[PDB]
Amino acid sequence: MKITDLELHAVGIPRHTGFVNKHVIVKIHTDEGLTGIGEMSDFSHLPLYSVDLHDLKQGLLSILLGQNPFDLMKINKELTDNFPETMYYYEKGSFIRNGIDNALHDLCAKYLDISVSDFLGGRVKEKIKVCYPIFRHRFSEEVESNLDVVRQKLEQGFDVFRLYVGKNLDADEEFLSRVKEEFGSRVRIKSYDFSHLLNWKDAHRAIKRLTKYDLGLEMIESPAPRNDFDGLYQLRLKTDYPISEHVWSFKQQQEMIKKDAIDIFNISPVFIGGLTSAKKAAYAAEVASKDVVLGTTQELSVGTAAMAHLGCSLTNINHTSDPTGPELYVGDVVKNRVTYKDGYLYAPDRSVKGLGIELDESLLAKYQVPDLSWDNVTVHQLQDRTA
Amino acid sequence: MKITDLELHAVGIPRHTGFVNKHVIVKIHTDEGLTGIGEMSDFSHLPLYSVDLHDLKQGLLSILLGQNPFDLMKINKELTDNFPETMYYYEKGSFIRNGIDNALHDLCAKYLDISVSDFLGGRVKEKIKVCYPIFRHRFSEEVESNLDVVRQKLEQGFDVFRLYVGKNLDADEEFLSRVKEEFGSRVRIKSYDFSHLLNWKDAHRAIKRLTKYDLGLEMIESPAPRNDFDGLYQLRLKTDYPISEHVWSFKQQQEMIKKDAIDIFNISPVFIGGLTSAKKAAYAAEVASKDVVLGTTQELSVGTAAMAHLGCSLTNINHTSDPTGPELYVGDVVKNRVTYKDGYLYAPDRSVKGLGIELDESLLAKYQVPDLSWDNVTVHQLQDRTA
Amino acid sequence: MKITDLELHAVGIPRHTGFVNKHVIVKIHTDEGLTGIGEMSDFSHLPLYSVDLHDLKQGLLSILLGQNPFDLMKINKELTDNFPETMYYYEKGSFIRNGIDNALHDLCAKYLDISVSDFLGGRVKEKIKVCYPIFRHRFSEEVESNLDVVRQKLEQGFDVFRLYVGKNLDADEEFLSRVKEEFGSRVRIKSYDFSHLLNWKDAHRAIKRLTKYDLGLEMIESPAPRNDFDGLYQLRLKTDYPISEHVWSFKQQQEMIKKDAIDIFNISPVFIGGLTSAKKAAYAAEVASKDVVLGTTQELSVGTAAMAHLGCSLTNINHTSDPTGPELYVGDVVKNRVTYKDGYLYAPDRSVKGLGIELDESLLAKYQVPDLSWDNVTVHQLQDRTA
Amino acid sequence: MKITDLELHAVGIPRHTGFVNKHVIVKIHTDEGLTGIGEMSDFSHLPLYSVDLHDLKQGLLSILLGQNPFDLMKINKELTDNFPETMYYYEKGSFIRNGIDNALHDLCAKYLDISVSDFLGGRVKEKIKVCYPIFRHRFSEEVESNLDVVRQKLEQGFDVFRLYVGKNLDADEEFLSRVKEEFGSRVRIKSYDFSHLLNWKDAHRAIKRLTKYDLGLEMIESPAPRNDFDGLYQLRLKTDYPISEHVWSFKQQQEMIKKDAIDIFNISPVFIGGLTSAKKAAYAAEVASKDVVLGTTQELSVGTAAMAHLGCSLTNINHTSDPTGPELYVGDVVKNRVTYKDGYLYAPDRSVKGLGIELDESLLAKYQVPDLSWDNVTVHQLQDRTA
Ligand SMILES: [Mg+2]
Ligand SMILES: [Mg+2]
Ligand SMILES: [Mg+2]
Ligand SMILES: [Mg+2]
Numbered sequence A, B, C, D: 001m002k003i004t005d006l007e008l009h010a011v012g013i014p015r016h017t018g019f020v021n022k023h024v025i026v027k028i029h030t031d032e033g034l035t036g037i038g039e040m041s042d043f044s045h046l047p048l049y050s051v052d053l054h055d056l057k058q059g060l061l062s063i064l065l066g067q068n069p070f071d072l073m074k075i076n077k078e079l080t081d082n083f084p085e086t087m088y089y090y091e092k093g094s095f096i097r098n099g100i101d102n103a104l105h106d107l108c109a110k111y112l113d114i115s116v117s118d119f120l121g122g123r124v125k126e127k128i129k130v131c132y133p134i135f136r137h138r139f140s141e142e143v144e145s146n147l148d149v150v151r152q153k154l155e156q157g158f159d160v161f162r163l164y165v166g167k168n169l170d171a172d173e174e175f176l177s178r179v180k181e182e183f184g185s186r187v188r189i190k191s192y193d194f195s196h197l198l199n200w201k202d203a204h205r206a207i208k209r210l211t212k213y214d215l216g217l218e219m220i221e222s223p224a225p226r227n228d229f230d231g232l233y234q235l236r237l238k239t240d241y242p243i244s245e246h247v248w249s250f251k252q253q254q255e256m257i258k259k260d261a262i263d264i265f266n267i268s269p270v271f272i273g274g275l276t277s278a279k280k281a282a283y284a285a286e287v288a289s290k291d292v293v294l295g296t297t298q299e300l301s302v303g304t305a306a307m308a309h310l311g312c313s314l315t316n317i318n319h320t321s322d323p324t325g326p327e328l329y330v331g332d333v334v335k336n337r338v339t340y341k342d343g344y345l346y347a348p349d350r351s352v353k354g355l356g357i358e359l360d361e362s363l364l365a366k367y368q369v370p371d372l373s374w375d376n377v378t379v380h381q382l383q384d385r386t387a
Helices: A053-064 A072-082 A092-112 A140-155 A169-183 A200-210 A229-238 A250-258 A275-287 A301-311 A361-366 A379-384 B053-064 B072-082 B092-112 B140-155 B169-183 B200-210 B229-238 B250-258 B275-287 B301-311 B361-366 B379-384 C053-064 C072-082 C092-112 C140-155 C169-183 C200-210 C229-238 C250-258 C275-287 C301-311 C361-366 C379-384 D053-064 D072-082 D092-112 D140-155 D169-183 D200-210 D229-238 D250-258 D275-287 D301-311 D361-366 D379-384
Strands: A003-014 A020-030 A035-040 A127-129 A132-134 A160-164 A188-193 A219-221 A243-246 A264-267 A291-294 A344-346 B003-014 B020-030 B035-040 B127-129 B132-134 B160-164 B188-193 B219-221 B243-246 B264-267 B291-294 B344-346 C003-014 C020-030 C035-040 C127-129 C132-134 C160-164 C188-193 C219-221 C243-246 C264-267 C291-294 C344-346 D003-014 D020-030 D035-040 D127-129 D132-134 D160-164 D188-193 D219-221 D243-246 D264-267 D291-294 D344-346
Touching: A003 A053, A020 A092, A035 A092, A035 A301, A053 A072, A053 A092, A072 A092, A072 A275, A092 A275, A092 A301, A132 A140, A140 A169, A160 A169, A169 A188, A169 A200, A200 A229, A229 A243, A229 A250, A250 A275, A250 B250, A250 B275, A264 A275, A275 A291, A275 A301, A275 B250, A275 B275, A291 A301, A301 A344, A379 C072, B003 B053, B020 B092, B035 B092, B035 B301, B053 B072, B053 B092, B072 B092, B072 B275, B092 B275, B092 B301, B132 B140, B140 B169, B160 B169, B169 B188, B169 B200, B200 B229, B229 B243, B229 B250, B250 B275, B264 B275, B275 B291, B275 B301, B291 B301, B301 B344, C003 C053, C020 C092, C035 C092, C035 C301, C053 C072, C053 C092, C072 C092, C072 C275, C092 C275, C092 C301, C132 C140, C140 C169, C160 C169, C169 C188, C169 C200, C200 C229, C229 C243, C229 C250, C250 C275, C250 D250, C250 D275, C264 C275, C275 C291, C275 C301, C275 D250, C275 D275, C291 C301, C301 C344, D003 D053, D020 D092, D035 D092, D035 D301, D053 D072, D053 D092, D072 D092, D072 D275, D092 D275, D092 D301, D132 D140, D140 D169, D160 D169, D169 D188, D169 D200, D200 D229, D229 D243, D229 D250, D250 D275, D264 D275, D275 D291, D275 D301, D291 D301, D301 D344
Parallel strands: A132 A160, A160 A188, A188 A219, A219 A243, A243 A264, A264 A291, B132 B160, B160 B188, B188 B219, B219 B243, B243 B264, B264 B291, C132 C160, C160 C188, C188 C219, C219 C243, C243 C264, C264 C291, D132 D160, D160 D188, D188 D219, D219 D243, D243 D264, D264 D291
Antiparallel strands: A003 A020, A020 A035, A127 A344, B003 B020, B020 B035, B127 B344, C003 C020, C020 C035, C127 C344, D003 D020, D020 D035, D127 D344
């Protein structure tokens, strides 16, 4: 069983918020005819440069050609050798490794005629509670619209949300106040996400005022600058609420564990390099007796399926998670999108071998884009995912 | 696919050193007729009490009956719930979990018609370098015999050994001196193992005198009391050689990582609860950028096969390992023992589904023992594995 | 005075060692006709992906178009906003910012009819002592050739070299032994560079054996993994020799200062984002009373000129530096290359406004490459800069 | 281009508060006829001794004569060699270096026919928000007068003030209460300045009671004894408000950064040695991701212009600053004083080469004083700047 070819399909898919993200769908072919599909999710994050896909295909083929897809450890070592961890939340090399590794999981599972779920340790649960995102308000006039989003998504079954804050505390607080007023306890905002925008003391001030509104609050996320382990730790001591932070590299995670800097490790395949790398991070957290939440960059159904399988295999996810990409994007590239019901993300049919998802060639063509080039966008928009 | 029954076969097998160990061979039956075999290796360690196997079978069946063998994470969680980690090197509950988990790996692999190697992440290598053990000298008159062991094993292909030290430094040093004198550089003693017998300062003194003899020395193992993380750390700073310590619980490992107490994590399925638990520990070490060595309690071919598969899947084993059980025991319970050549342990045939090993019912009967009861033995003998 | 257009010229230039690097020459045009030239030096480092230059030109123009070139702080803030620091030695975004910022310095200086030297604080010295690199030996058979390099470069005036070590200590030591034997004290090897390849304890062992050879040794560089501040600190306490490390981000530098992890800060424009960013790093080091050495990625004459101007303005460079790009590359893109005499890099003519260098359009065409795509190369080769 | 002569003009100028400060206006002449003007601001601080200006002129000429004004780094090194940093807030040697360095900036800019703004990195903003000072109350009967100051300055456009506290908490609190009562939210008191008068615990008590009044409070300044880094740190952990402290030497700043002792670094040219030294301090703060506020000793228009140029070039000034000297002093020595509008200090006309200020010889004569001798004044008056 050996890899014979690789295909990278670039697509552009807008969100209901108006933000347009570019993704890359992966296809890994073998000598036996089995093909694994994967996803290099959301390249639309800073830095403001783009990766040449023609060159990337050559580099990746050079690595994969002739290899046994079952050699996951070997292949991931070589992938990391060529795309080193950088201690940066949005390293494009991590998105790349992720697409290859989840495609390999799909491939191996298909070959074995089993769901990726059973290739990852089986299931602990059949679905995971998630939350719908409300992007940060930079202005008070943005509140009304966001309240309608809550009203609409709640009616659709999403009773839990998360709020990005930090830019305009008055606006943040106006929103939280309106929500509590209109929905009482019907809606929960499980997290206030600062996106590394504030130094910890300022975050402390913000946290102190925002936490006046506790609508089923579960955690405060990224309340310090990237890699500010000391700040995270001090904040963890001053905050009653659990502190959560994204895991973007093993070194970064090791340090947060060494310093006991946080309470919840936000782990997501795309930011750490794939399912293989995410499992290592999740197991490290388990060994450290740390809580885990399944994070997201907001991916399409292929990427969401992959993470749903991993999510349902973990024993230390005791809080609400974040992947709601297929609900946020207006389009997708599959025949049947992953399913969300009552604010829960369901793991794909365990009876279906592979990821449990199927590409729709007509949709791949429909959303096709010539490259990962950038369009007109501001830094604020890239940070907040707004348009 | 569900578990329907469980069998526990107790056996007693003497070593060439004269020490007799008791093991338990596991059989996990399913509704579809597939059976997974496992091993609860070497129960012959302190504390000086024994586990009732009739009661254990009931407790384990209560847990396993009706479950899907592929739910490894779920099952291991329940196993740990019933057999908690204790921070003790020889917790019998860990040996128990190990036997069940490796039997489940065998079962799942058989069902999928693949080697356990491909169920663990494939291969990074086809064999792992190991060393033959020379148990500690309590007296100078024990040296001669041990020199013959070296002479004999070297001729058989084992050019690397490890030496247990600490009880009699004069004897330890006499041995090392004789070896260097007779074999020059033909033989390497990759580790001096103190077995947690000395406080770190005394170990430092011992290390300073013993390291006068460096025959390809790779590490100093367990040079401090059990769980003495501060001592290990101080010794790590005073020793040029890497310091290695066994991983017997996640809490213990977390602490050694938090304090950067050691250089090499000695990981072995039997002491941590199985392949699933060992993978978690190995991945935690990888995330922490720490070296790993495959340790051992000296198991039979079933247990050695399981660890050989895991060993060949890891990317961070850069030193000589220790599993040489099948070479140390006079008998075994399989049709074909694992293979050792030129001081290397080979991973079972990757073409053979499952563990790649086969039980020999006649040998199971031959070595059968009614229970895990203890025979006449001293504390020194249990610590040194001598007779 | 405003920016009106931008040009990015990709080139490929082989080294005498056989390694081929790709660079990007920058041109920033203004309404008044003045053009600043710059260099995005050596993109040929991992990660193994390449930046789309057509897209990059658009992104950069979006930032620069219409701006006043004299607004260096404002522009650098916006550059960093779009190309965030990642805590990674070879972040391509840093090379990009560097090319833009040094082109802006050239532009501003030209407008003022002064040398970049006088735009950076004048001069403290007219030349800086540098060393010629001897890339790491992976095999003993590579020694002879490297000895000839020393023999040849010494005859040309380079009496100081630096040696990359870590892969094969026997080979490293063979080289050092041969050199001392053949040249006595005629040649100095000012640094042993581990390139973050070893954990600090292994580096300590290596340092202990390699430092048996002290041929005017000034420092040990990168003797620990990237961002291993604790390791650097411990090594700094165990090593008599100064410990030096590259500055690749302000956060990383802040942490090495907070922990007093090193003795010498290796600062180079390309890895930190340009002259503006390098000045900030150098001043931070000065405020911290820390020694500085001018590092390098080995750039062409445009990039080397820029760093020569900065180098000669600093008051805390008390050791031998590393930029010898124009001596290492077989070709260049200027009419007159920077000058090296007696192992010293001379700052460009202070009477010549701007960088003091002039592009040669025929050479730009000669070395032109269609893009920054990768050719066949191994990880070892990318780490060691060998072919 | 070389320095040929130096002039030091001592002047005495009273404040509207009645306090009389002595300053020294600097003139640096060159062979080409260009003259740079500078200011050694407010020598009227303890210690109670004065510097002989005849001797100083000789010492400074010895240093400057024949030098190239563009050699800022070289000259500042030599200035610091002769006037060492002492870790004291009011080291007269710092005022001296400051006057020379800002005069050199004026000189270099004039030669280049550009504003000092463009010699410092351009602009990030065109004006900086400042606050008017209310000096500490030692008695309750001093409150009324200070309330009139607020009433009067507010009408003139200053809506932000800062209050010196610590001597009489009852008086401090009486003032704050009256202000809030009479102006509601019309006026903001951005800082409560303890002037290093109290030990941190006493400051904590004072802070706890004073912060009952939050009129746009931005920071607590100098809430611990000089150089009490541990105290500043403990207070930073116990105070929600940012803690700010003056930077009077690089060693002091390095230590506050090493210990993460404060939130905001109050940087001002006069206390650190000039624009060159202040830029180094500001860049160090930037590298440390620390906020900066432009502090003051309250200087004349020459010194305020210099700092206005630096202030508008920094990217990390996110709070209200303090320089309001030209509004506080009854007289000045220039043709046109720096401009303040709506509580903002405007950077001098960017079209005017040099500092953008012009000396008025008649005013220099008017305010001339024979030396820097002290008049009758008490320690309390020198600490509080009262009369
Ligand atoms: Mg995203
Ligand atoms: Mg044992
Ligand atoms: Mg380079
Ligand atoms: Mg003053």
